[PDB]
Amino acid sequence: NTLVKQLSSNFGAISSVLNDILSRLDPPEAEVQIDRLITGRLQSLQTYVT
Amino acid sequence: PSKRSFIEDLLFNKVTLADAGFIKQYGDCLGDIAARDLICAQKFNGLTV
Amino acid sequence: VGYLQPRTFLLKYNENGTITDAVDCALDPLSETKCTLKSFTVEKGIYQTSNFRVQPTESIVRFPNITNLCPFGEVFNATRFASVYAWNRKRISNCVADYSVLYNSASFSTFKCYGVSPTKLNDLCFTNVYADSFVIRGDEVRQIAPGQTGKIADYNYKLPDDFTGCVIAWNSNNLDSKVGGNYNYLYRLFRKSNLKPFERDISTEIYQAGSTPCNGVEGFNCYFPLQSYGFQPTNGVGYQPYRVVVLSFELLHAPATVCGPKKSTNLVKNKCVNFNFNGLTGTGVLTESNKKFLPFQQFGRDIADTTDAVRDPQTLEILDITPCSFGGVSVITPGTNTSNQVAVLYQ
Amino acid sequence: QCVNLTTRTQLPPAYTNSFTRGVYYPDKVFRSSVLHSTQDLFLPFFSNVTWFHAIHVTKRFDNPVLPFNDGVYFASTEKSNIIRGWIFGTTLDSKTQSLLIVNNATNVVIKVCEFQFCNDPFLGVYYHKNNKSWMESEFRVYSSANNCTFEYVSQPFLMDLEGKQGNFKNLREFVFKNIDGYFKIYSKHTPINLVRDLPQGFSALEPLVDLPIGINITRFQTLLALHRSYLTPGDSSSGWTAGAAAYYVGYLQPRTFLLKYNENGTITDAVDCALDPLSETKCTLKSFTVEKGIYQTS
Amino acid sequence: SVLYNSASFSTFKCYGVSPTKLNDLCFTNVYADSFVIRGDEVRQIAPGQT
Numbered sequence: 001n002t003l004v005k006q007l008s009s010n011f012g013a014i015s016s017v018l019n020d021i022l023s024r025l026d027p028p029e030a031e032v033q034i035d036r037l038i039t040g041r042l043q044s045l046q047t048y049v050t
Numbered sequence: 051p052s053k054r055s056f057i058e059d060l061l062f063n064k065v066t067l068a069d070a071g072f073i074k075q076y077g078d079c080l081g082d083i084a085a086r087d088l089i090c091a092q093k094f095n096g097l098t099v
Numbered sequence: 100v101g102y103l104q105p106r107t108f109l110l111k112y113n114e115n116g117t118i119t120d121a122v123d124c125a126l127d128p129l130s131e132t133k134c135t136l137k138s139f140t141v142e143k144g145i146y147q148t149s150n151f152r153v154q155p156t157e158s159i160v161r162f163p164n165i166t167n168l169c170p171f172g173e174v175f176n177a178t179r180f181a182s183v184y185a186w187n188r189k190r191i192s193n194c195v196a197d198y199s200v201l202y203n204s205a206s207f208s209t210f211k212c213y214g215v216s217p218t219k220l221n222d223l224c225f226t227n228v229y230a231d232s233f234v235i236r237g238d239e240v241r242q243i244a245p246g247q248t249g250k251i252a253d254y255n256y257k258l259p260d261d262f263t264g265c266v267i268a269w270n271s272n273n274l275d276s277k278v279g280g281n282y283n284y285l286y287r288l289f290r291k292s293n294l295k296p297f298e299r300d301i302s303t304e305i306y307q308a309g310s311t312p313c314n315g316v317e318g319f320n321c322y323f324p325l326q327s328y329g330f331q332p333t334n335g336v337g338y339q340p341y342r343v344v345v346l347s348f349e350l351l352h353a354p355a356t357v358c359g360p361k362k363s364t365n366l367v368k369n370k371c372v373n374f375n376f377n378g379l380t381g382t383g384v385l386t387e388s389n390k391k392f393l394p395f396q397q398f399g400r401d402i403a404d405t406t407d408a409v410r411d412p413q414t415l416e417i418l419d420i421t422p423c424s425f426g427g428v429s430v431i432t433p434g435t436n437t438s439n440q441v442a443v444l445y446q
Numbered sequence: 447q448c449v450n451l452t453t454r455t456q457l458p459p460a461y462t463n464s465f466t467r468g469v470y471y472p473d474k475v476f477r478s479s480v481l482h483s484t485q486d487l488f489l490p491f492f493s494n495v496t497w498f499h500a501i502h503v504t505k506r507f508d509n510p511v512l513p514f515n516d517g518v519y520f521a522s523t524e525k526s527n528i529i530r531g532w533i534f535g536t537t538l539d540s541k542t543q544s545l546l547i548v549n550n551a552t553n554v555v556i557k558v559c560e561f562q563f564c565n566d567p568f569l570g571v572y573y574h575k576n577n578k579s580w581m582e583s584e585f586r587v588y589s590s591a592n593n594c595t596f597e598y599v600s601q602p603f604l605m606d607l608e609g610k611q612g613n614f615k616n617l618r619e620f621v622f623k624n625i626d627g628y629f630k631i632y633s634k635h636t637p638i639n640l641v642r643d644l645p646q647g648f649s650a651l652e653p654l655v656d657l658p659i660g661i662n663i664t665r666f667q668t669l670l671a672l673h674r675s676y677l678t679p680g681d682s683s684s685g686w687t688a689g690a691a692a693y694y695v696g697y698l699q700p701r702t703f704l705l706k707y708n709e710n711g712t713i714t715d716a717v718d719c720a721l722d723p724l725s726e727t728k729c730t731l732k733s734f735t736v737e738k739g740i741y742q743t744s
Numbered sequence: 745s746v747l748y749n750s751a752s753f754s755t756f757k758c759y760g761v762s763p764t765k766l767n768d769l770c771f772t773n774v775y776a777d778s779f780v781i782r783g784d785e786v787r788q789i790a791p792g793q794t
């Protein structure tokens with residue numbers, strides 16, 4: 001349940017919702033926000049597995 | 051039905067598993083039931099038991 | 100003749116550099132385990148592959164019923180603009196934002212958008228739209244931006260640090276220059292403190308530069324705060340007049356009414372479909388909902404913060420949204436060395 | 447014309463306690479069956495609010511000019527529509543711009559102009575004995591209003607205006623904020639049956655309006671109404687009774703709250719996370735129930 | 745602010761500091777460099793230019 005709850009973190013991005021970012025932003029500017037979210041969520045999975 | 055002793059039956063009723071059974075169908079939680087029941091919220095995000 | 104699709108392949112290079120074999124990673128679960136193990140040989144066992152995935156069939160768009168065009172003609176083509184100190188603010192609502200009608204009559208030297216990409220404007224719906232209008236000197240146009248200094252950005256007009264909207268500016272020497280000199284436009288030069296964002300100060304009190312109070316007499320070190328621009332046809336480009344419009348709005352949180360040009364389709368239910376609701380795009384299955392929204396809200400969000408309910412902008416009915424990819428899969432193989440026959444378990 | 451009211455007894459100010467009052471919906475997203483934390487400008491729990499009367503018996507027609515620090519929680523216990531509106535501004539003397547929100551007998555009027563407000567603004571209701579009827583006679587708020595930037599007038603209605611005799615029957619709660627040129631108003635109306643003291647309970651306020659005024663508010667003043675009849679003999683400055691009413695003022699601070707949403711989407715409970723260490727452990731555990739033990743707080 | 749009522753600058757850009765913080769800072773080893781160029785070449789007065 002903690003893994004499910006940690007999906008609402010921005011990790012320093014404009015929003016935590018991918019669909020919100022993908023609309024209102026074009027690919028070159030959406031890529032940096034998506035990259036921040038990807039790094040944060042990989043870290044959450046790593047902590048869980050350890 | 052279960053060939054369990056009396057004491058084993060008493061012991062098995064004192065620990066409550068999070069989910070009984072491993073077949074939760076897609077049609078079982080469609081719409082409101084999703085995101086309310088915790089198992090379906092887990093399963094819509096790739097987390098399986 | 101055959102037709103190509105976007106796929107992932109696992110290619111094999113021998114010791115001479117030629118591709119001698121390949122695996123199509125999405126043909127079979129067996130091929131998927133080959134792709135994951137990064138080998139062409141699989142040993143006997145049971146492997147987890149991937150959750151069962153469903154691809155969408157249709158695409159739907161649902162925008163509100165709007166017929167009128169936005170007032171581009173009394174915003175960008177007004178006969179008289181305001182002074183920068185007493186700048187003008189106008190509400191905009193209930194209109195289609197088809198801005199290509201400006202192409203054949205208007206040319207803008209400056210057009211910059213904050214918080215949104217200019218290529219997405221055609222697919223969005225806008226909340227609480229306002230237009231601010233004034234006239235400034237050309238040199239000062241660089242000051243209409245967040246986090247700027249200078250007399251315009253300190254005493255006359257201030258933008259927030261977190262600003263969503265667009266700034267548009269064009270040269271208007273033909274309209275606002277008079278051969279004698281145009282002194283209708285004014286600006287503030289002296290102020291005790293800087294302005295707050297979106298604040299308007301229109302007072303005319305004698306400014307006290309030093310000690311020895313003025314008693315509103317305008318003496319030595321006691322000034323009249325407002326001063327006039329001198330606009331003449333023969334000025335340098337830096338000193339020529341510029342007309343400025345600032346558009347301010349909000350996106351994807353509350354019910355909207357402007358909603359740029361895009362045609363709506365029919366509502367289809369109980370199928371996985373790409374969807375666009377008031378500019379918010381996604382994929383999933385739409386079902387009837389028992390939730391009751393209060394009149395001021397448009398979207399519903401769950402614990403993970405993703406949107407799971409939406410009010411329909413046409414029929415005003417609440418709909419639930421569900422993902423269409425669910426369920427675990429496993430593959431049982433006796434070994435690729437022995438055979439290619441496999442079994443599949445759907446959990 | 448402006449008239450300075452006389453014959454009003456001066457009394458020391460009174461204070462009371464706010465029992466988990468002043469909660470509003472922070473945003474416009476529907477949520478259900480969830481505990482949600484949010485940081486915003488709230489009225490702290492169990493605070494110390496100021497109390498003002500309009501009780502004839504002393505007269506005590508209170509209408510002071512009050513500060514507007516970071517936003518105001520305003521509560522009103524009424525039975526006869528005495529509290530009629532507010533004026534917000536900095537100097538209130540036609541050198542600066544001010545905001546008027548008034549409810550006259552027929553319309554709701556919101557104006558942003560350069561007003562020369564009266565020193566003692568009020569509204570006047572007159573009562574006729576020969577035919578029993580209460581009608582609005584006086585509007586003594588400002589002398590002149592010159593440069594008006596924003597104006598709004600509502601659709602016509604008829605208000606009651608009749609003087610009542612029972613105990614207080616209506617609680618009206620408002621929250622006022624001023625951020626980035628927007629004046630934000632939240633409100634809620636509630637039926638009550640009490641005589642004194644702001645009551646207990648919980649009720650979240652809903653968004654009401656968001657005005658783009660763009661002015662520098664620093665102070666504010668409440669607009670009340672008067673009753674005149676044949677039993678109020680005198681000139682303008684002395685022939686007036688009061689009519690019972692009470693109002694309470696508190697000031698908002700930036701706080702973190704833990705709000706509770708039931709299965710219908712309404713906020714039914716809240717925790718002020720910085721009141722007590724116990725509340726802080728409630729906030730950390732994200733629950734309203736704490737089991738027996740020892741907890742590290744901060 | 746004594747420059748406001750007599751001078752107008754077409755270009756003013758600050759590196760390593762925000763223009764809104766200039767009023768609250770103290771400055772070490774201040775130098776001013778002066779020259780005259782053609783208008784087209786103004787874009788070249790910036791780090792990493794050719």
Ligand SMILES: *[C@@H]1O[C@H](CO)[C@@H](O[C@@H]2O[C@H](CO)[C@@H](O)[C@H](O)[C@H]2NC(C)=O)[C@H](O)[C@H]1NC(C)=O
Nearest residue numbers: 291292293294295298535536537661662663664
């Ligand atoms: C809003 O108005 C207030 C009141 O006029 C301003 O605050 C005063 O500022 C002067 C000097 O600028 C001080 O001497 C006073 O002590 C201040 N009064 C208070 C109550 O703080 C305030 O500066 C104005 N806001 C802006 C952005 O100019």
Ligand SMILES: *[C@@H]1O[C@H](CO)[C@@H](O[C@@H]2O[C@H](CO)[C@@H](O)[C@H](O)[C@H]2NC(C)=O)[C@H](O)[C@H]1NC(C)=O
Nearest residue numbers: 447448449450451452538539563564565566683
């Ligand atoms: C009500 O009383 C106030 C005083 O509190 C009067 O206001 C004064 O008016 C005189 C004459 O115009 C001025 O010299 C003072 O400076 C004012 N005082 C303040 C504090 O503003 C007001 O005139 C009275 N109302 C009347 C007489 O109708």
Ligand SMILES: *[C@@H]1O[C@H](CO)[C@@H](O[C@@H]2O[C@H](CO)[C@@H](O)[C@H](O)[C@H]2NC(C)=O)[C@H](O)[C@H]1NC(C)=O
Nearest residue numbers: 458459460461462463464492493494495496497
């Ligand atoms: C609520 O606030 C008032 C005003 O600050 C408090 O009244 C003060 O109380 C202290 C201690 O009793 C006195 O020394 C002050 O003189 C009081 N001030 C005034 C203006 O009377 C009051 O104590 C606070 N708490 C409650 C419960 O009313």
Ligand SMILES: *[C@@H]1O[C@H](CO)[C@@H](O[C@@H]2O[C@H](CO)[C@@H](O)[C@H](O)[C@H]2NC(C)=O)[C@H](O)[C@H]1NC(C)=O
Nearest residue numbers: 549550551552553554555582585598599600602
């Ligand atoms: C309450 O205020 C409104 C707004 O000022 C008043 O309505 C105006 O009344 C004048 C006088 O007849 C008209 O000329 C305006 O056209 C009205 N404005 C409207 C209708 O929008 C209203 O009369 C006031 N009511 C009372 C009882 O004073």
Ligand SMILES: *[C@@H]1O[C@H](CO)[C@@H](O[C@@H]2O[C@H](CO)[C@@H](O)[C@H](O)[C@H]2NC(C)=O)[C@H](O)[C@H]1NC(C)=O
Nearest residue numbers: 182184185186300301302303560592593594595
């Ligand atoms: C605020 O009001 C003042 C006073 O009415 C305005 O100043 C006058 O405006 C008229 C209208 O053109 C002029 O004829 C006068 O010469 C102005 N000055 C004086 C001393 O009367 C002022 O323009 C208004 N402010 C705004 C922003 O409209």
Ligand SMILES: *[C@@H]1O[C@H](CO)[C@@H](O)[C@H](O)[C@H]1NC(C)=O
Nearest residue numbers: 112113114115116117118119
């Ligand atoms: C690779 O090149 C060598 C040398 O030319 C050749 O003998 C061999 O047959 C080629 N192919 C493979 C698979 O090694």
Ligand SMILES: *[C@@H]1O[C@H](CO)[C@@H](O)[C@H](O)[C@H]1NC(C)=O
Nearest residue numbers: 171172176200201203204205
């Ligand atoms: C703007 O107004 C002028 C005034 O007649 C008109 O000639 C011109 O065509 C207008 N441009 C538009 C509406 O784009």
Ligand SMILES: *[C@@H]1O[C@H](CO)[C@@H](O)[C@H](O)[C@H]1NC(C)=O
Nearest residue numbers: 163164165411412413414415
């Ligand atoms: C919009 O259109 C739909 C269908 O065309 C209609 O049912 C509805 O009443 C219209 N108006 C609103 C406000 O939804």
Ligand SMILES: *[C@@H]1O[C@H](CO)[C@@H](O)[C@H](O)[C@H]1NC(C)=O
Nearest residue numbers: 574575576577578579580581
């Ligand atoms: C009777 O009532 C009407 C309206 O309520 C009022 O205008 C009138 O003045 C009243 N009669 C007298 C004598 O005042």
Ligand SMILES: *[C@@H]1O[C@H](CO)[C@@H](O)[C@H](O)[C@H]1NC(C)=O
Nearest residue numbers: 391707708709710711712714
């Ligand atoms: C919620 O809504 C239902 C249906 O309208 C109602 O029966 C119930 O009393 C409401 N309140 C709670 C706390 O469930």
